[PDB]
């Protein structure tokens, strides 16, 4: 679920504040997305967006309000290590891995201040 993804980021990148840092970054980090990502970080977000897309299109999963963000899994954090609980059902595991892969990705992408709150009507 959304809150848990926020905590994943705090786990992968300890000195970080997610809502502020990664929301409305580039073209994909934020609600929806458009165009080509600008950045490796932005790419991390596009892949996340696509991961949620695929999850919605697993005909065996029916998320509340049709939003995968709505779905909790369990997962733990041990010194930069995110671990998805094996006991999460197939749909929760999938979402879990979207979030975790995205937090691992964010932790290795260059953060470019330029791109925070990008003019998306122009550059995306
Ligand atoms: O996925 C989204 O729609 C927005 C979104 C994207 C990336 C990181 C985030 C961190 C905290 C809250 C929202 C976030
Ligand atoms: Ca997005
Ligand atoms: Ca759940």
Q: How far apart are CA 79 and CA 85, in angstroms?
A: 16
Distance 27 CA to ligand 3 centre (A): 29
- Residues having CB closer than 6 A to ligand 1 are 6, 18-19, 22-23, 29-31, 45
Beta-bridged to residue 75, according to DSSP, are: 84
- Cβ distance 25 to 116 under 8 Å? yes
Could you tell me the residue range of the domain that residue 17 belongs to?
Answer: 1-124
- The CATH number for 72's domain is 1.20.90.10
H-run or E-run covering 75: strand 75-78
Number of structural domains found in the chain: 1
Residues of the binding site for Ca(2+):
28, 30, 32, 49
Please provide the DSSP assignment of 83-118 as one string: EE-TTS-HHHHHHHHHHHHHHHHHHHSPP-GGGBT-
């Amino acid at each position: 679920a959304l809150w848990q993804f926020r905590s994943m980021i705090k786990c992968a990148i300890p000195g970080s504040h997610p809502l502020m840092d990664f929301n409305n970054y580039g073209c994909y980090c934020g609600l929806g997305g458009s165009g080509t990502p600008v950045d490796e970080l932005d790419r991390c977000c596009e892949t996340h967006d696509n991961c949620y897309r695929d999850a919605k299109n697993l005909d065996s999963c029916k998320f509340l309000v049709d939003n995968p963000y709505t779905e909790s899994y369990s997962y733990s954090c041990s010194n930069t290590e995110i671990t998805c609980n094996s006991k999460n059902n197939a749909c929760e595991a999938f979402i879990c891995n979207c979030d975790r892969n995205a937090a691992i990705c964010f932790s290795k992408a260059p953060y470019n201040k330029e791109h925070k709150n990008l003019d998306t009507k122009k550059y995306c």
